[PDB]
Amino acid sequence: PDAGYYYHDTFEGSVGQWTARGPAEVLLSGRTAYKGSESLLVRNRTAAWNGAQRALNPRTFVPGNTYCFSVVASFIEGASSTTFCMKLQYVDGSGTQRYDTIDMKTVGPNQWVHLYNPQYRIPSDATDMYVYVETADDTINFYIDEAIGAVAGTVI
Ligand SMILES: [Ca+2]
Secondary structure, three states: OOOOEEEEEOOOOOOOOOEEEOOOEEEEEOOOOOOOOOEEEEEOOOOOOOEEEEEOOOOOOOOOOEEEEEEEEEOOOOOOOEEEEEEEEEEOOOOOEEEEEEEEEEEOOOOOEEEEEEEEEOOOOOEEEEEEEEEOOOOOOEEEEEEEEEEOOOOO
């Protein structure tokens, strides 16, 4: 736990547990950043659902519990505006993969937007969990920074 944070990805010389969702690719970039000098670039998307993801440990993010999730995202080109969605990917009690929305924000180019939900409740039957970031309907390259999973209510 922490200053309440369970995880806090700054992107300074490390990707942390972040990986690509779909056939995309994620890597550190110094072209833009919200804090420090780097951020996580997400590119090679061929469908809007592609993006950046991180597995969530059920020992720490108990299903049925409420938690805080936060991230800042931006893009520079490829669209005139986009809708960033921060989400939870999981498998339910029936063995079916579900996608639940944690937060979503629409923004134009060259502008950091804050994806944030201090009170997100994880469905009680969830297993094999992943928090992910995508855009709703484009395949633009985008950047994320300051990725945080924390205690319900944490002010970010
Ligand atoms: Ca950074």
